Design a protein around this ligand. Sequence first.
Ligand SMILES: [K+]
Ligand SMILES: [K+]
Lengths: 121, 121
Amino acid sequence: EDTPLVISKQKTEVVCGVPTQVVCTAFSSHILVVVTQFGKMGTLVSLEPSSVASDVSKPVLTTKVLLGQDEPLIHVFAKNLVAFVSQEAGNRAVLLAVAVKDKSMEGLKALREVIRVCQVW
Amino acid sequence: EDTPLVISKQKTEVVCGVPTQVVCTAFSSHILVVVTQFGKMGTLVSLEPSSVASDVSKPVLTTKVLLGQDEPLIHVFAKNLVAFVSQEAGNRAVLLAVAVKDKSMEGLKALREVIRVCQVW
Ligand SMILES: [K+]
Ligand SMILES: [K+]
């Protein structure tokens, strides 16, 4: 027997032909989101609500690549993949591990649907 | 129903009076180890096998604090907590999320025992 201290949910789903496992875990000040294809951990991105820029209505979601190649697309993709998680979880920081080599709008929408199935906030 | 793509195991155990959840997940090039108390994600540390120093028998396990306060004890503690994971998993990198405020040798040994219960390598 076991009783978790934090809520986690996972789901394996095919996304644009690729089996993909999603895991979401709710910590008090972070949601950890894992999106893994082909057994790989991929790129680790922190998404931190930060000081407003021109729009004072909502925090800026600042991205940092912590592990893996720091290249510009993954920052933008990560924001579109999990900004909704941060927002819905009370403007909480998100730690994302993302291993998705072949990206598209169709795939992005499908990944967000799996993350929604794994909602823990 | 569901079928994971990566092996994960978790356990909640009391360690020196504190309920602690451990999760280990095996990716092809990383073991992700979560050690959480009080619902917190804590400090994120990467432990990367790296170029030898004076002892040529084994890689150096280089630590980097990726999220949380970068202070010297957590580097050393992290190495003693999960070096065995890296070694046993084929000198694999480890990504550690560790939220343990009150550290001791007794507690360190007990945490390693929980990580062993959650072996995924
Ligand atoms: K990948
Ligand atoms: K902590």
